[PDB]
Every structure is written in C-alpha cells, then in structure tokens.
C-alpha cells in the first residue's frame, strides 16, 4: 500500500523483499527493508537481512507509489527500486527514486521535483527511467539525462513499454477494419523518434477492446519487424498474435483482467499467470490455451 | 482474418462430414468432438469482437453449425442452445433483452430493412 | 540446503540472451563473466557482490584467462583483442 504506516512487497532472486514506511518520531519516517528467504525445513520465511534509509526535510505524507526490479544502465545489473512521494502540502511533490544494492544500502537516482500530483500511468523502465501520465500529456525522465522530456507523439494509452534488440527503448500505444496490415497501433522509439512500425501489430477490430499487452518475442526480418504479443481484453479473453495473426484464444473465468506474466516451471510446462481487479488469478497453459488453476482472494501474486 | 475464420469454419464442417460418411463408433465421436470444440473456440474468437456487421453472416452460420452438431451428437436439444440463439440475436440488434418473442420481432424488422443475411436468419 | 543459489541478476532483452557469445570462467574463487554486451563482471564467490566491472566497446564475444600471469584476454566484435591485468 501507498501511505504512512503502510508497506509493499516485491521479489528478487528467490527471496522476497518488503518495504515499509515507519515514523521516526526522534524526525521524518525511515524507509525500512526486510528481505526474507524461504526456509524449506520449517516452511516459513526467515529474515536474512534488513536496511534503513533516512529521509530529511521534516514534512508529512510519505507514500510508496511503486516498486519492482528493473536494471542499472551503467552496470546492466538487475536491482530493485522504490518510488517515494514526498508531499509538503505546498502543491509540491518530490517523487524520489531509490535503488537498493546487494549491501542493503540505498541510492538516490532521481529527485524529480514535480509541482502537480502524479497518477495512473506510472511505469518504470530498464535504464532507471520513469514514465508518467496526466490529461494525455505523457512525460518521461531518465537517469543519464536528469531532464523531464515530453512525448512528442500524441498517444491515448501506452499498453506496453520496454527495451528491444537494436532499438534500445520502445512504447506500444495508439494516437487517436479486419486488415492485418492496418494495425491502428504505433510503436514509438522513445526520445520523440520515429514510429518505427505501424505494419504488423494487432488488427483495428481488436484494437478497441484490449486493455493490456505483453510481448513474448521479437524477431527482425528486414527494416520491418515481427513480434509475438499477448493481449487481454474487456471481454475477458487472452489472445496470442504472430505477425498480426490472431491464434490461440482463451476465455477467462473471471472479469476485468489487469496483468499477465509468464511462469516457466520446468520443461515446456509454461503458464500465463493472469491477475484481475477482483483480487483473484488464473493460470492458463501455454501450447494449449486451456485454464489450469483458479485461485481466489489473492492479496498478491509473485 | 475473416478469410481465416471462414477457412476454419469450412475445415471443421468438412471434418464433420468426413466423420459423418466414413468412421466407426469411436473415430466418428473423436473427429466430431474435435470439430465441436473447434466451433466453440471459433464462436469465442468471433464473440470477442463488438458488433461487426460484416462478421454476422459468419457468426450466425457458426452458431447454426454448432447447434446442429451439438444436438445431433446429444440426440436431442437443451436450453443452452436457446441461449446461443438469444446471444446471436442480441448481437444482430447491437449492430442496430426482453425475451425471444420481442427479440425475433425486432430482428426480423431489422432484416426487412434488407441487410442481406436472411440465408442465415432463416436457418436460425 | 538450496541446491541452487542466485548471487546476481543482469539486464537482458525479450525472449532471452542470444546463445554462444556469453562466457563464464572460474579462476580460483572469483568468476569472470560476459553476457554478449559491452560489460565484463568479476564476482568474488564468498561475496555475492561484484569486485569490478569493465566497459569494453563493441560487445565482447570471447574471454580467456592466465592464472600464472594474472591476465584476462578479451575479444571485441569489430575491434581487436584486449589484454587486461
């Protein structure tokens, strides 16, 4: 959760991480880390390390926006991050980005010093880059830059983002009828560069319903490219695509899905783990789109 | 895409007819209960799209084949078939709720506007 | 207890890493690594932390070591061979 006296979970290299705002009082709250490891004998999580990070500027309203594991652009090493909103109630919001190292020590990367309040369209990207959204004004700020760039192209949604081979950084999305080649969906090479593809993304019919996207593979035949992307929809469907060709549809039990991830788990036993807003989840097979598990109440999935 | 759906439909019909002519007690049911789930999947693939005037002549056809094959294997009817019919009619109306009677009335007025899919409506 | 230990995690593109080019060499305790990118890492086993990272231009394709000379031979793509102490 995102508040004072609230916490958030994460996962990193077979050991779970927990981040908590805890009021100092003797002083600003202190960001506390507890990394826990599964014991396997006692069937419980034992603490193996912890780490405190001190905050200055005795103002209230500390709020944990987002946490995951991304990378360092300098080293190309996967390390976990936290976003921390510092709200002094003066219509000013810092939004610190912090990175944790293997010494359980923190490192500021972005002070980020905004005036207005940040909302829904938050994403974090490989080189420690933040990508945020208000009224259809998409912005992003990178480490290595320190500067708030605006997205030149006028997008509605940014369904997927991340790095691709030979291109470096990418956003899917749209701008503003059963033909594969039409696609309605502009890729965009970040830093206000060329669209780079509008040839073999999902058809325009599907284009109205999809609410989340997750790419599984990207090959490069010529100046164009070929992506296999999973989507998921308002009508509770999981769809695969290959060169714009819809294959392997599944019909989810529950409603209004939010995200999809991939679990390898052995030789060919590949599962797509789907979460929803109803605090429940499914696991569908790969290689035969067929529901396999239907867990419920599910505060979090990892 | 429409060509792909059409070709899957035709492929499945042809598999069904092959089992109908050839096949023994086990192999018939094998090919048939393959084709039936294929037509389920294709219904779901077509039901994932909003309204689609150009699709309806394929959707009504697919649900007709699905009903016919379902009923012929079961050797009888059910109420799930009436729900399928109700769903396809709701779709035809969404292009342009209460009960099957008023549904049919409004659907047939909407077809007597002469969008030409009467070769599927009359089969329904 | 655990038959496997993850002591580091590196940046990778979609799908995964391209095979062949990444290299891994255990000297005595430390481990030298490349992922077919512009970096070479040293990891001091007994310490999950890295010792040092080396930026090569023009992504590395192959590594070799000499323990008596304490030398690391590295091959870049369109550039040549580097020999670091």
Provide keyphrases for this structure.
part of a larger assembly, 3 chains, B: 124 residues, mainly alpha, 0% strand, C: 85 residues, mainly beta, four-stranded antiparallel beta sheet, three-stranded antiparallel beta sheet, 7 strands, globular
Question: What report would you give on this structure?
Answer:
This is part of a larger assembly, with chains A (302 residues), B (124 residues) and C (85 residues). Chain A has 302 residues and is mostly beta strands. Chain A has no helices and 23 strands. In chain A, the strands form 6 sheets. Chain A has a 4-stranded antiparallel β-sheet, with no helix packed on it. Chain A has a 4-stranded antiparallel β-sheet with strand order 5-6-7-8, with no helix packed on it. Chain A has a 4-stranded antiparallel β-sheet with strand order 9-10-11-12, with no helix packed on it. The radius of gyration of chain A is 21 Å and the shape is globular. With 124 residues, chain B is mainly α. The longest helix of chain B is centred in the N-terminal third of the chain and has 23 residues. In chain C, 9% of the residues are buried. With 85 residues, chain C is mainly beta. Chain C contains no helices and 7 strands. In chain C, the strands form 2 sheets. Chain C has a 4-stranded antiparallel β-sheet, with no helix packed on it. At the A-C interface, strand 16 of A face loops of C. The PDB classes it as ligase. The entry lists the keywords Complex, ligase. Structure of the human Fanconi anaemia Core complex. Chain A: Fanconi anemia group B protein.
* Rg result of chain B: 15 Å
User: Largest interface: which pair?
Assistant: A-C, 23 and 20 residues
Helix content of chain B: over 70%
Helix content of chain A: under 10%
PDB class: ligase
Keywords: Complex, ligase
Entry title: Structure of the human Fanconi anaemia Core complex
Chain A: Fanconi anemia group B protein
Topology record:
The structure is cut from a larger assembly and holds chains A (about 300 residues), B (about 120 residues) and C (about 80 residues).
Chain A: E1 7-12, E2 15-22, E3 30-38, E4 45-54, E5 62-69, E6 80-86, E7 96-100, E8 106-110, E9 123-125, E10 129-134, E11 137-142, E12 148-150, E13 161-162, E14 170-171, E15 188-189, E16 212-219, E17 226-232, E18 237-242, E19 245-251, E20 257-263, E21 271-276, E22 281-285, E23 291-293
Antiparallel strand pairs in A: 1-2, 2-3, 3-4, 5-6, 6-7, 7-8, 9-10, 10-11, 11-12, 13-14, 14-15, 16-17, 17-18, 18-19, 20-21, 21-22, 22-23
Chain B: H1 2-21, H2 25-47, H3 56-74, H4 80-95, H5 100-112, H6 118-121
Chain C: E1 23-26, E2 30-34, E3 39-44, E4 50-55, E5 62-66, E6 71-75, E7 81-84
Antiparallel strand pairs in C: 1-2, 2-3, 3-4, 5-6, 6-7
PDB class: ligase
Keywords: Complex, ligase
Entry title: Structure of the human Fanconi anaemia Core complex
